[model samples]
Target: NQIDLNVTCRYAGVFHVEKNGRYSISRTEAADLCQAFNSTLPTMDQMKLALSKGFETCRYGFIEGNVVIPRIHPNAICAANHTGVYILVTSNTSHYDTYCFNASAPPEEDCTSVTDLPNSFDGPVTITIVNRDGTRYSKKGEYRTHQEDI
Candidate 1:
């Protein structure tokens, strides 16, 4: 039998930035960035990695009809509704539960259990970037200033 992906895995992603203290990231663009970020940023420990869709539905979930998961990304999901997003898989799928009992635990945690966020969910959520030498980078907005300068 396979374990169901009942929970949400925590994913850490770096946003585009600049020097002017402006955010080049939008709620939508963030989804676009997620694709590349997921591929290369795996080395960073601070940013947790999770399974993506690339699911094919808008019913995942979001507040005020907002969108979180992107169909263009690796594992985009599609559904019809509002609140949050979830990847629904059945037992018939080969990847559903085959890798759960592997060496490291699967990247599945309840979405509701994931916290440590801002109440507004509007502006940037500040976080510090750490360096290997323990020097650490300067702290600023969660979103970089000029991530997208067109």
Candidate 2:
């Protein structure tokens, strides 16, 4: 079984200046630039969702919220003086890479976990699991019986 992806959320770097190897751009500019490419500057919720889908970066990125976030956790060195998952940094004042999203209409679907084993068996089966916190677990092997079973 596999997860179904409905939303088309994605991230792209803000192309302008570079600070500490991170592209920087004002939130306002990022928003506009994103739109220029038929995309959008990801919002706080969108960013969080993207992070869960393996999106990451060493430098902080701009989100459409009141405060700034580093995507990993609360960071003081980056745009210090902020709060929440990370410190606060004024939108118009500071510049950072913008996580762009070419997201379209909302998804009309939901998610559900699979239960029970398959009706048939296969060789070298593998199963992968994902956590809401972005953690992943994968197990691959062939099931066998002990000699005593005979």
Candidate 3:
């Protein structure tokens, strides 16, 4: 059996971050994010990308490739306004790409985990919304620290 590996750079769209050039955070995700600002969601390629920039973790910087996953420490998303207005931008390219909306903001008293799932190919994924009116609350996924709800 012979396996061939190409040591060349082919530029796999770096999820949302890579797309900062195009994709921007949208407000439609506010209800989605505010719902679980106290929980951590699965970290997918794109979701992870949102985690990186939205949270302002680029201070560490993101490496170039289909492997950019932002640091999801505090929360996958958050909502500071009592109105619960947060947001997330996806790289679905087409509406058919996005799926599965989990977490119902899980009892505000129980937001313990923020999880964001990745795109299957395991490529460089991220979350960004290109909105003009609303601020892109794409970062700080659904979550709350030990002291958030308590």
Candidate 4:
């Protein structure tokens, strides 16, 4: 596979940083919001990674590390008067933009369609974690995909 894992593109909200393109929410909120898209706040290394992969924009948003960093050069306004290139701002502060992480692949199995199982049922599930090189790791039990419908 020739996939470039190091060069995943990030998508910032159009017009504004907060979820739904409005308001500056905290990191926890941001993470939860991004969860819908399988994304999260960009980590320090991720921020640098994006910059390295030609990610350039003249805007500041809540990157990871409880810090606000510009996608490109430190622009005029939010971080203009700040000291370091990446400025640490209070989490409670609002209206700032957010930098979101868009991963290349989904890490977990999709529980919605369980293999060789009923759509809505109850029983022990067989879970397996096989390595890329054919290494086998199996767990047999009611390990997943069970719902408590009363």
**Per-residue accuracy of model 4 over 1-150 as CA lDDT, tens digit each:** 110011112322211133323444455544543443345667766666555544554345666665555445455664564333356545455545556665642222211211221121233444333222344333343211213210
TM-score of each: 0.21, 0.42, 0.17, 0.45
Off by over 4 Å in 4: 1-17, 20-22, 57-60, 81-85, 89-95, 105-150
Could you list the CA RMSD of all candidates, in the order they appear? 16.0, 16.8, 18.6, 14.1
Please provide, for model 1 over 28-91, each residue's C-alpha lDDT reduced to its tens digit, 9 standing for 90 to 100.
Answer: 3333223212322122222113333111222222211232332333332243232233334332
Tell me the lDDT of candidate 4. Answer: 0.41
Task: Write down the RMSD of candidate 2 (Cα, Å).
Answer: 16.8
User: Residue 96 error for model 3, in Å?
Assistant: 22
Give the TM-score (vs. native) of candidate 4.
Answer: 0.45
> What does candidate 1 score on TM?
0.21
Encode model 2's per-residue lDDT on 1-150: one tens digit a residue. Answer: 321111112332211112223344555655553453355566666655555544444445556654345344434664354433353544445666554554542332112321222221243545333333334444443222333211
2 or 4, greater by TM-score? 4
Full ranking by TM-score: 4, 2, 1, 3
Q: Which is the better candidate, 1 or 4, if ranked by TM-score?
A: 4
Q: By TM-score, is 1 or 2 better? A: 2
- In model 3, state the lDDT of residue 133: 31
